Amino acid sequence: HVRDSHHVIYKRPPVNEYCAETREDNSLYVPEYCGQNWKNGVLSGMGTHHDAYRNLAVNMMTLRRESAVSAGWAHSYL
Amino acid sequence: TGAGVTSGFIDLATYDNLDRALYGGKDATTYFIKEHYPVGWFTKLPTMATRVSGNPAFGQEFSVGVPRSGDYVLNAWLTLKTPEIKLLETNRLGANGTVRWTKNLMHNAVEHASLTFNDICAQQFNTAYLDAWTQFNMCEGKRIGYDNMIGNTSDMTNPTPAQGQDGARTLPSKNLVLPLPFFFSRDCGLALPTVVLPYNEIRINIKLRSLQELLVFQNKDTGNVIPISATDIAGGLADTVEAYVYMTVGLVSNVERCAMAGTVRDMVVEQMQAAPTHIVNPQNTNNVHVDMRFSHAVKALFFMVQNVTYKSVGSNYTCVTPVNGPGNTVMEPAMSVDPIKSASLTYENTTRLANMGVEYYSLVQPWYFSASIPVYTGYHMYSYALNVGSVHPSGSTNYGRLTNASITVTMSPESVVAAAGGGNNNSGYNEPQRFALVVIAVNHNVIRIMNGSMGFPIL
Amino acid sequence: TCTTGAGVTSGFIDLATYDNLDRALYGGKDATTYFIKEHYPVGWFTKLPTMATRVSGNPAFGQEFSVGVPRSGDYVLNAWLTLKTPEIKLLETNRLGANGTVRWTKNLMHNAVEHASLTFNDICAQQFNTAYLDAWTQFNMCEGKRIGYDNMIGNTSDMTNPTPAQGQDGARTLPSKNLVLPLPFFFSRDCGLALPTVVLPYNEIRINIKLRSLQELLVFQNKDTGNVIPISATDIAGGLADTVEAYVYMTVGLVSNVERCAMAGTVRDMVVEQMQAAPTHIVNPQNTNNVHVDMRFSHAVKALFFMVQNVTYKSVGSNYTCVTPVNGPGNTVMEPAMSVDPIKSASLTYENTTRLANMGVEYYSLVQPWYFSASIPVYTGYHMYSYALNVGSVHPSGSTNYGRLTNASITVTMSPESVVAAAGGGNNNSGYNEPQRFALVVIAVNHNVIRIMNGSMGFPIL
Amino acid sequence: TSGFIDLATYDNLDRALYGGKDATTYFIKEHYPVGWFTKLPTMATRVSGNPAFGQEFSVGVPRSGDYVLNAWLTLKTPEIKLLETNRLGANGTVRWTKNLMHNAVEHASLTFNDICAQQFNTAYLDAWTQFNMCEGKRIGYDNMIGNTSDMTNPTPAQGQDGARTLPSKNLVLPLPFFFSRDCGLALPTVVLPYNEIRINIKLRSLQELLVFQNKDTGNVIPISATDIAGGLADTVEAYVYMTVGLVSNVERCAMAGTVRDMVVEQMQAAPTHIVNPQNTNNVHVDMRFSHAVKALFFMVQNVTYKSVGSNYTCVTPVNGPGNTVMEPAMSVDPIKSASLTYENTTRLANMGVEYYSLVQPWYFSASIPVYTGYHMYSYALNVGSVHPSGSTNYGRLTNASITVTMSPESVVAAAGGGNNNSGYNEPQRFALVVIAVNHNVIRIMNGSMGFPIL
Amino acid sequence: ATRVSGNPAFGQEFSVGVPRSGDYVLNAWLTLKTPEIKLLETNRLGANGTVRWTKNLMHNAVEHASLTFNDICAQQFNTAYLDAWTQFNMCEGKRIGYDNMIGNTSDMTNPTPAQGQDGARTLPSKNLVLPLPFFFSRDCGLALPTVVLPYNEI
Amino acid sequence: VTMSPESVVAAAGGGNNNSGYNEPQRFALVVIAVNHNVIRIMNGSMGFPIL
C-alpha cells in the first residue's frame, strides 16, 4: 500500500566505501560461478573517488616547496 | 575654524532615557569588532558535461549525463555557437525584406529543459518561466551582463537588408551562454550530494527549437511576417549545431564526507508548474475565466497573454507585433498596450481578490514582494510570499486540499481592436492578431536522500 | 580535443594545499560548512489586499480626506494611494495663444500630497510632505525598481512633455490614467513592525491626506520666452474637475489562532522613526550670501536632509536647482544652459564650538551618500549628513538627541551662479529671465519608542 | 474573511514547513542593544613633501581617536585652455584621459611605522570598481572621479568654433583599505599607541594625464606647456580625509589591554609582460604569489600612447562628430582564450574568454563589467564578502603559470595601415597585467601590530 | 565496441565505449568504408581536371583521436604523431601490408580524369583499417584491467 | 630552425607549369613530443598520482 524508489540491495557495495575501513573486494570483483556476468552497471560513473587518492596526493605534496631547492644538487653538480 | 576631534565629546555627553533604552547596556553588541568563525575547507572547479546520445541539433531533443565523481554540483550552463546569416537577393520579399534574430534569442530554442534523476523527471522549465523569472528577479548591475549573454545585444535584433541595399551587414556568429536555473543552482546551501548518490544516473534533456522560427523575416514596408527558408539566406539552414554544457563541481574534506556519509537528509526544493495555454479570441467576449489546477504548496503565480500571431516572433507579450523602424532598427509601434485590463481570483465562487487593475499586478506587487520590477509590458504576477526570491519558506497556500479555483481576466479595447485587422502600413496590427493566455505557478517540495538515492516522500 | 591535465583530479592539488594560515582560517570540529542549509519552522499565516473605507470628507483637489484602518484583521503592513488623473485638452483661446504649452509638473506624485498623517484616536504619530518624500526616494531607492517607480509616479515622458495648442503641430493630449504612490510609514518600513489591530480595539486609526489645487499641478509654459503664469479654467477645454477618484489600499495579514491567543494581552514596545521639518527660511542672496538657520529638534536624530528650492513660480515643483526649466526642441523639456545647486558650502554649529567646518558642497552631495546610504541621488541638490552608519536600517545606529543639546544652527554659503540668477536680465529660454527667489528647507529623521498596552497607544518617553 | 479559506488548508507538507511551538514568527522583530558611539570627519596632518603632479607625498593618519574607519582623497583640477599655437595646429584637440581619477595614482601605499602594510594602483582600482560596484551608486562614482562628458570630451583650439574649456572642479576618490572594506574591521588606535600609521601617494606628471588627439588622422602626441594657455602648474591642491569614531569610556577601558587577531585583504601585482602578437599567438606569465589567493584579475592593456589610460582594447579611442570621443567598429578585447597550469598539470583548460568575461562575474561577484576586457577568476563563492571563503595557499605551491592565446583582430591591429580615425593607424603594443587578491592575518598586542605567520 | 555518442559522419565526432563484462583489453582498430568517387564532365575545370585521394588517406580524417577515463583525458594523438611514429617505428616486412591498410595502393592515390577522357577509371570503394596506438596496445604486458576497474567508463 | 634557399624561392610563386609551386607556398612548423607517465590502480579505480 506504500512504495519508495530508493534501493533494495543493502551494503553489498556499501555506500561508505570511499572512507577508510574494512574492504569488501572479495565479492564484487569476481563472479561467484562460471557464467555470471560482471557487476558494473551503475557503479561505473564515479572515477578517481575514495580518500586513498587524496591522501596519496597530500603525502606526495607534504614539503615540496621546501624540498624543491636542493632536488638535483646531489645528482648533477659534481 | 573647527574644533577637530574634540567636537565628539559634546555629542557623546548627550544621554537620556531614550538613549539608555536604545544603546548602552552590559551586553550590547558593539561594532568595529567583527567576530570570526571558521568555515569548511573546500575547493571548486568547472568540468565538461558528458554527451550520452547523438549530437545537438535544431528542433531536436538531446540528453547529457551529469558528470559524477565530485562531491557537490551547484552550477550548470549551456554554451551555444550561433550560425552565420547572409541574406540574398533571391528572397521572395526582394528589396522589401529584412532578416533579424528574434528578441531573446536565448530563452528561445530552449524549451522543456528538464532534469531527471535516474529515470524520473525531477524538474522542467521552458520559455515562459525563464522570461518571467528573469524579468522579475534580475539583480541590477548584472542586467547588462545578462542582455549580453542571452542576446538582444543590438546586433542580433537589428534588421539587415539584402545585399543589394545599403545595409549589407551580416549577423555575427558569436557564442552565447545560458545558465540553467535548477534547485541546486538556486542557492549554494542546496547542492547535489553526488558522492552520496552512487545508485542514480542524473540526466539533463534540452530540446532545441527549429531554426526556421528562430529567424524573423520582416517586410520592410507593410510589416508582415513570413517563414524563412533555406533559399532565402546563403549556405542554408544547418540543422546540426555546435553546443556544449558546462558544470561546476566542488570537493570537500574527507572528515566531512565520512561524517555526512550514510545518513538520511531532507531537502526543500523549488520547481514550476505550467498550465496549458488557452487560445483567446477577444472578438467574441472580453472576459475569460480559466480553471487553475496545481498540486503542491504554490508560492508565486505569473499570468501573461502572448501574441501568437506569428511563430517567428517570440516573447511578444504586447498586443501589437513589432515592426521595422528607421535606422535599420526595430521600432516599437506607439499603439501597443498589454491586453490584460483587469484580473481577479475566485475560490469556489468566493472572490478572494477583487477585480483589481492591471497596474496593480504590474507594479505594486513587484515593488513590495520582489527584488525587481519588469521593464516591459505584461508580466503580471501575484505572490503569496513576502519574498519570492528567498529560498527559505514564506507565506504559501497548498492546492492539494484546496478545491477548484479560477482566474478571471478582462481584456482591453486596444486588444479588441488589435484582434481585428485594418491596420495601416508599419502599424503591426495590419493582419489580424491572435492571443494565448499562459499561467505559470511556482511552489515548494521536499526531496529525501537516503540509501544512495533520491525520492519524494510527500509526493 | 580533451586536455590531459584537465579534470577533477586537478583539485586534489588544491585540497592538499594546506598550511597554518589555512588551518587557522578554515577547519575545526565546530566549524560550520557550506553546501548544507539548516531548516527551521516559521509561523503559519496568510495575506490579502483590502480596500480601506472612507470616513471623513471626499476625495477632491485642494481638500483633505480621512481614511479609516479596516478591522477584522491581525496585522497591517502596507499602504498605497491610487489616483485617476483627469484629461487635459489645451485650447487656442488661451491667453498666450500660439506661444503657450501645458504639461504636468515634474514628480506629479510627491505633489498634490502633503500633511499625510497617521492618527490613533486624537494624536499624530508622524507626518511627511513633498521634501521628505523626494529626499527618501532619492537616497534610499533600490536600483532596478527605479524604472517602475518613475513609471508609477509620473515623469513618464508623457505627462511632463509640453503639448502646444490644438492649432499647432503638437496636438497631443495629456493621457488620463491612474497613478499609485506607496505611503512611507513605520509599519511599511519593515515586516517586523506592524500594527496589532487585534489587540488595539476601540482606538480608531485614521490616515489623513490633503491634496493640492489643480492650478498648482499644471505648468503653463510660454513656448518662446520661457515664462510661467498660473493656469485658468477657461484656458483649457472641459474645465478643472475639482473632484477626483482616489482610493487607499492596504495589505492585511491573518495569523494562527494559537499565536493570536499568545500575543493577546501583552505589552508591546516598538522602535519607530519620525521626521521633523524646520520652518522654511526665505533667502535673499542679493543682500548676503551666508544664511544661518536654527534647528529645534527633540529626539535622537538619524540624519539631516537639506536643500534650497527654487520658489519663483508656485506651479512648478520639485525644482531644487537655481534655474527654472524651459521648453526645448521636439516638444520636450530641456535642462537650461547653466544650472547648479545654489548652495556652495555648509557648516554646523552648537553655540560656537563648530562641529562641522565649512566643507564643500560636493562632500554632502557624493561622499556621505556613497558611505552611509543605499543609493546616490541622480538630480542636483539633496544634501544629507547622517549621524548613523546606515540611514535605511531600521535597527538603531549612532545618533544624538537634541533634547539635551543646546541651540544648534546650520550655516549655508551660496554661490555666484545663485547670486547672479537671483536677478533677472537673462535672454530668451535662459530660465532666469525673470528675477528668481529661493527657499531653504531642513528635515531631520529621529527615533522614538511606541508602547502598546491595555488597548491603548502612547509614547512612554514623552 | 476570504483568507480563512487559505488558512484552513494545512497538510503534512505545511506542517513540516511551518508551525511548531519553537517556530519563529514575523511581525515581531526582536530588538537588542548596540554600542554607544559617535563619528565625525577630520583633517590629516602632512608630514613630508608637497602636493605636486608627478611627485610622491606622505600623510600621517590622525591618531588620538578611537576607531578610524574610512579614507578618501580630494584633489582640485587645473584649468585647461587650448591655444592656436599648438604643434597640431588647427587639427588638434585636448581632453582629459578616460577615468581621470583612478589615474595619476600609482603605488598608493599604506605603511605602518617603516614597514609596508599594503598597496594598490590603477589596475587594482579599475578591476575592483568594475567587478564590485553596486548599482545606484554607479552614477555617483563615475561622476565624482571625472568621466562626466566634460573632462573627457574633446575641445578644439580657441580660434576654432569650439571655445569650450575644461572646467576646474574638485574630485574625490575613496581609498580602498582593509579598514575601509568593512565596518567591523577598524584600526584600534586606542590599542596602538606606538605604531605610526602613514599613507604614501605618488601622483603622475601632467604630460601623460592629458590626451592630445588629432582631429583628422587620429594620432596622439605628448602635450607641452607652451601648447596650452597659461602653462602647466607642477603643484596641485589636494587633501586627505578620513572618518574617526569615538566609543564609550567603559567599553574602551574593558577592551584595552588584550590581544586581538584580524583578517585583512591585500593586493599582489605580478610584473607586466610586453606582448608582441606579430610574432607569437601565445603568452605565458609566471605567478609568484605567496598568501592564500582569493581572486585573480588578468587583462591586456594597449600601451601605444602614455596619454591614454585604462584602455584594455586593441584599438585606441578616436574623435567623433559633435565633439565627442568614440571607439571604432573594430573594438573588442584582444584576449581570445586563457588557461592556468599548476606545476605541469592544467587546473583549467583552454576555455573561452567569454567565460571569464561574463559567467564568473555572474556567479561569484556583485556586478558585471560594462567595458571590454576585465577577465577574472575567483576561488571563493563571494569576492566582495570579507569573511574567509574558498582560497588556495600559493605559499605551499610550486611555480604556477597562466597562458593566454591572443586573437586575430589583435594580431591585425598590431600592424598599422588603417585609414584615418581607424584607431590602429600606427602599430599597436600590448602589455599583460595580472593582479591577485588574497587573505592575511594581523595580530594586535602590546600596543603594536605584526604578522604572526608572515 | 559499441558506440555511445553521435553517429559516424565526416566532420563530426563519435565516442565509442570499451566493451564491459571482460577481463583485459589489449588492442583497438577502426574500420571505415570509402565512398564512390566519379568525376563529371561538368566540373569547374572541365576537361583539364583530375580527382584523387590524398596521399596517406588514413592517418587523415582521424584527428584529435583521444582516450579518456570517465572524467579526464588519458591521452590523444593526431595526424603528425601518427605519421612520425609510423615512419620511425616501422617493422619491415609489415611495411607493405600497413601501407595497404592505410591506402597508398596506387588505385586510390592515382588521379583519374573525367569520364570524357581516355582514363575512365573510377576509384574503388574498399574498406580500410587503422590500428589505434594506445598504451595498452604498445605492449602485451600493459593491458586495461576492465574487471578490476568497475568505477570508470573508458 | 634555419630555412633553405629552395624554401625561400618556393615561397614566392612564378614557377612554370607542373613545377609544383605555380602559386606562392606557405609552411607551418609542427613540433611534437613523446614522454613518460605513471598510472596507479587501486580501490577499483585508476588515476594519475603525480599528475
Side-chain angles (χ1 to χ4, degrees), chain C residues 67-85:
Chain C
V67 165
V69 161
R71 303 286 176 189
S72 78
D74 285 0
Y75 299 88
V76 62
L77 73 165
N78 198 329
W80 63 91
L81 178 64
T82 178
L83 188 153
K84 180 67 173 66
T85 78

mmCIF file of all heavy atoms in Angstrom, chain C residues 67-85:
data_model
loop_
_atom_site.group_PDB
_atom_site.id
_atom_site.type_symbol
_atom_site.label_atom_id
_atom_site.label_comp_id
_atom_site.label_asym_id
_atom_site.label_seq_id
_atom_site.Cartn_x
_atom_site.Cartn_y
_atom_site.Cartn_z
ATOM 1 N N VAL C 67 -9.162 58.410 5.975
ATOM 2 C CA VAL C 67 -9.452 57.018 5.659
ATOM 3 C C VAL C 67 -9.190 56.176 6.898
ATOM 4 O O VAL C 67 -8.104 56.247 7.483
ATOM 5 C CB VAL C 67 -8.602 56.521 4.476
ATOM 6 C CG1 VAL C 67 -8.648 55.014 4.394
ATOM 7 C CG2 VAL C 67 -9.090 57.142 3.178
ATOM 8 N N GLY C 68 -10.177 55.381 7.298
ATOM 9 C CA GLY C 68 -10.041 54.543 8.472
ATOM 10 C C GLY C 68 -9.351 53.224 8.175
ATOM 11 O O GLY C 68 -9.484 52.661 7.092
ATOM 12 N N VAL C 69 -8.604 52.735 9.156
ATOM 13 C CA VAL C 69 -7.923 51.446 9.021
ATOM 14 C C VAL C 69 -8.938 50.330 9.252
ATOM 15 O O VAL C 69 -9.613 50.325 10.294
ATOM 16 C CB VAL C 69 -6.762 51.346 10.004
ATOM 17 C CG1 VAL C 69 -6.367 49.892 10.211
ATOM 18 C CG2 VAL C 69 -5.577 52.154 9.503
ATOM 19 N N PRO C 70 -9.081 49.389 8.322
ATOM 20 C CA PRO C 70 -10.084 48.332 8.490
ATOM 21 C C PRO C 70 -9.776 47.427 9.672
ATOM 22 O O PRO C 70 -8.618 47.174 10.013
ATOM 23 C CB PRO C 70 -10.007 47.558 7.169
ATOM 24 C CG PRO C 70 -8.635 47.829 6.656
ATOM 25 C CD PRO C 70 -8.323 49.236 7.071
ATOM 26 N N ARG C 71 -10.842 46.942 10.297
ATOM 27 C CA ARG C 71 -10.754 45.987 11.389
ATOM 28 C C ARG C 71 -10.817 44.569 10.823
ATOM 29 O O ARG C 71 -10.624 44.346 9.625
ATOM 30 C CB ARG C 71 -11.858 46.246 12.411
ATOM 31 C CG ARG C 71 -11.853 47.650 12.985
ATOM 32 C CD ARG C 71 -10.709 47.833 13.966
ATOM 33 N NE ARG C 71 -10.626 49.201 14.461
ATOM 34 C CZ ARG C 71 -9.626 49.672 15.193
ATOM 35 N NH1 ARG C 71 -8.603 48.910 15.540
ATOM 36 N NH2 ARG C 71 -9.654 50.943 15.588
ATOM 37 N N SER C 72 -11.058 43.590 11.697
ATOM 38 C CA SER C 72 -11.226 42.174 11.382
ATOM 39 C C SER C 72 -9.931 41.505 10.942
ATOM 40 O O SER C 72 -9.934 40.296 10.687
ATOM 41 C CB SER C 72 -12.299 41.932 10.309
ATOM 42 O OG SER C 72 -11.801 42.226 9.015
ATOM 43 N N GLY C 73 -8.827 42.243 10.842
ATOM 44 C CA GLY C 73 -7.536 41.668 10.545
ATOM 45 C C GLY C 73 -6.704 41.464 11.799
ATOM 46 O O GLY C 73 -7.171 41.614 12.929
ATOM 47 N N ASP C 74 -5.440 41.114 11.581
ATOM 48 C CA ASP C 74 -4.495 40.928 12.674
ATOM 49 C C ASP C 74 -3.328 41.897 12.602
ATOM 50 O O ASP C 74 -2.997 42.536 13.608
ATOM 51 C CB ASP C 74 -3.981 39.479 12.683
ATOM 52 C CG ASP C 74 -5.013 38.503 13.205
ATOM 53 O OD1 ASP C 74 -6.121 38.947 13.567
ATOM 54 O OD2 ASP C 74 -4.720 37.291 13.249
ATOM 55 N N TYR C 75 -2.694 42.029 11.441
ATOM 56 C CA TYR C 75 -1.591 42.959 11.260
ATOM 57 C C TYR C 75 -1.726 43.644 9.912
ATOM 58 O O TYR C 75 -2.056 43.002 8.911
ATOM 59 C CB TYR C 75 -0.233 42.251 11.345
ATOM 60 C CG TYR C 75 0.044 41.586 12.672
ATOM 61 C CD1 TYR C 75 -0.356 40.279 12.913
ATOM 62 C CD2 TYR C 75 0.711 42.263 13.684
ATOM 63 C CE1 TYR C 75 -0.102 39.666 14.124
ATOM 64 C CE2 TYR C 75 0.969 41.658 14.897
ATOM 65 C CZ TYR C 75 0.561 40.360 15.111
ATOM 66 O OH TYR C 75 0.815 39.752 16.318
ATOM 67 N N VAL C 76 -1.470 44.948 9.892
ATOM 68 C CA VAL C 76 -1.414 45.731 8.664
ATOM 69 C C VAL C 76 0.034 46.146 8.442
ATOM 70 O O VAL C 76 0.713 46.589 9.376
ATOM 71 C CB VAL C 76 -2.362 46.945 8.717
ATOM 72 C CG1 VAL C 76 -1.969 47.907 9.827
ATOM 73 C CG2 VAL C 76 -2.384 47.657 7.375
ATOM 74 N N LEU C 77 0.521 45.962 7.211
ATOM 75 C CA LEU C 77 1.933 46.192 6.932
ATOM 76 C C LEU C 77 2.162 46.877 5.587
ATOM 77 O O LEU C 77 3.266 46.781 5.035
ATOM 78 C CB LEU C 77 2.715 44.870 6.992
ATOM 79 C CG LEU C 77 2.557 43.832 5.875
ATOM 80 C CD1 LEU C 77 3.678 42.812 5.952
ATOM 81 C CD2 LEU C 77 1.210 43.130 5.943
ATOM 82 N N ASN C 78 1.165 47.575 5.053
ATOM 83 C CA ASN C 78 1.308 48.219 3.756
ATOM 84 C C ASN C 78 0.266 49.320 3.637
ATOM 85 O O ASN C 78 -0.719 49.346 4.378
ATOM 86 C CB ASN C 78 1.160 47.204 2.619
ATOM 87 C CG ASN C 78 1.727 47.708 1.315
ATOM 88 O OD1 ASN C 78 1.720 48.909 1.046
ATOM 89 N ND2 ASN C 78 2.218 46.792 0.492
ATOM 90 N N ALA C 79 0.507 50.238 2.698
ATOM 91 C CA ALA C 79 -0.438 51.307 2.394
ATOM 92 C C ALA C 79 -0.057 52.029 1.108
ATOM 93 O O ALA C 79 1.091 52.458 0.948
ATOM 94 C CB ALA C 79 -0.513 52.308 3.548
ATOM 95 N N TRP C 80 -1.007 52.189 0.189
ATOM 96 C CA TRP C 80 -0.734 52.961 -1.014
ATOM 97 C C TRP C 80 -1.995 53.680 -1.470
ATOM 98 O O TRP C 80 -3.121 53.277 -1.165
ATOM 99 C CB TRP C 80 -0.158 52.087 -2.138
ATOM 100 C CG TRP C 80 -1.061 51.010 -2.653
ATOM 101 C CD1 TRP C 80 -1.941 51.105 -3.689
ATOM 102 C CD2 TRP C 80 -1.148 49.662 -2.176
ATOM 103 N NE1 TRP C 80 -2.579 49.904 -3.881
ATOM 104 C CE2 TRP C 80 -2.108 49.001 -2.965
ATOM 105 C CE3 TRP C 80 -0.510 48.952 -1.155
ATOM 106 C CZ2 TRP C 80 -2.448 47.666 -2.762
ATOM 107 C CZ3 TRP C 80 -0.849 47.627 -0.957
ATOM 108 C CH2 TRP C 80 -1.810 46.999 -1.755
ATOM 109 N N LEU C 81 -1.776 54.774 -2.197
ATOM 110 C CA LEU C 81 -2.828 55.650 -2.692
ATOM 111 C C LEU C 81 -2.837 55.617 -4.211
ATOM 112 O O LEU C 81 -1.807 55.865 -4.844
ATOM 113 C CB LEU C 81 -2.610 57.085 -2.200
ATOM 114 C CG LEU C 81 -3.584 58.184 -2.635
ATOM 115 C CD1 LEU C 81 -4.983 57.935 -2.116
ATOM 116 C CD2 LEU C 81 -3.079 59.545 -2.184
ATOM 117 N N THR C 82 -3.995 55.323 -4.794
ATOM 118 C CA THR C 82 -4.168 55.352 -6.239
ATOM 119 C C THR C 82 -5.080 56.513 -6.612
ATOM 120 O O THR C 82 -6.053 56.803 -5.910
ATOM 121 C CB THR C 82 -4.744 54.032 -6.761
ATOM 122 O OG1 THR C 82 -4.936 54.119 -8.178
ATOM 123 C CG2 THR C 82 -6.067 53.712 -6.089
ATOM 124 N N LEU C 83 -4.747 57.191 -7.706
ATOM 125 C CA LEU C 83 -5.473 58.381 -8.123
ATOM 126 C C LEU C 83 -5.624 58.376 -9.635
ATOM 127 O O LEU C 83 -4.669 58.080 -10.359
ATOM 128 C CB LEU C 83 -4.754 59.657 -7.653
ATOM 129 C CG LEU C 83 -5.426 61.023 -7.828
ATOM 130 C CD1 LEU C 83 -4.913 61.984 -6.772
ATOM 131 C CD2 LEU C 83 -5.172 61.602 -9.211
ATOM 132 N N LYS C 84 -6.820 58.720 -10.106
ATOM 133 C CA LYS C 84 -7.123 58.763 -11.536
ATOM 134 C C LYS C 84 -6.984 60.205 -12.012
ATOM 135 O O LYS C 84 -7.850 61.041 -11.747
ATOM 136 C CB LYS C 84 -8.523 58.219 -11.799
ATOM 137 C CG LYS C 84 -8.942 58.213 -13.257
ATOM 138 C CD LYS C 84 -8.123 57.224 -14.065
ATOM 139 C CE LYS C 84 -8.652 57.108 -15.484
ATOM 140 N NZ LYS C 84 -8.475 58.369 -16.249
ATOM 141 N N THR C 85 -5.891 60.496 -12.715
ATOM 142 C CA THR C 85 -5.650 61.850 -13.182
ATOM 143 C C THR C 85 -6.655 62.227 -14.270
ATOM 144 O O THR C 85 -7.085 61.376 -15.053
ATOM 145 C CB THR C 85 -4.230 61.984 -13.723
ATOM 146 O OG1 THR C 85 -4.164 61.419 -15.037
ATOM 147 C CG2 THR C 85 -3.248 61.262 -12.817
#
